Amino acid sequence: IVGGYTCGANTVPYQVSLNSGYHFCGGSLINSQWVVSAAHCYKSGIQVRLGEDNINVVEGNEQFISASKSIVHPSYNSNTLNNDIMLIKLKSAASLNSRVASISLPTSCASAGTQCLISGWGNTKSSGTSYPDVLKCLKAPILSDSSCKSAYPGQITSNMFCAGYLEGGKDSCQGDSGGPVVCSGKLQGIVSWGSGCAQKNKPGVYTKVCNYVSWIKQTIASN
């Protein structure tokens, strides 16, 4: 997260870190055994780290639970990043508590201008890299489809939305992928991609989770 702020430990209790011996993507806990992340974060060897704040220090509250299933959307296209959503089933249910909590899925899509909280342990620099220890947060608005498509012509599918700040300086960034964009208490987005991070006129692009709620529910129900 570039231009964000330290969330505060466990203030984003649905935020998970996907760890493969390092944090590589975020995710969002949507029930005790399932995490939503980005399809492009798929890999083997995912350990979901819940309850994290400093991802480099065992501070307490962590639950590390291996992914037992990582379900990339069947229509994920790694070039276009359409359908950039993945469900991770935890090998065991996380113990939900105030610091490890699921985030609701949308019941409807979010509207432009809704403010969302985007969080993650991604790079905090728009140039160069600095990976934070603690979870960073960014309040960011959903942009209009027109602005999103203007920023990324031909690249924004119906399953994507832009959020953030066209003036630059505030964005999700590498390492945030897969993590939440929560708006009005609903996981409306998954950090997916963007041109750089926090670049002027290049807002973050996010998987539009509301398009996948049924898929999520059906996939969870069947797994």
Partner: peptide, 9 residues
């Protein structure tokens, strides 16, 4: 690029 570590560009 995707916002993963590493980015997929």
């Amino acid at each position: 690029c995707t916002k993963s570590i590493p980015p997929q560009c």
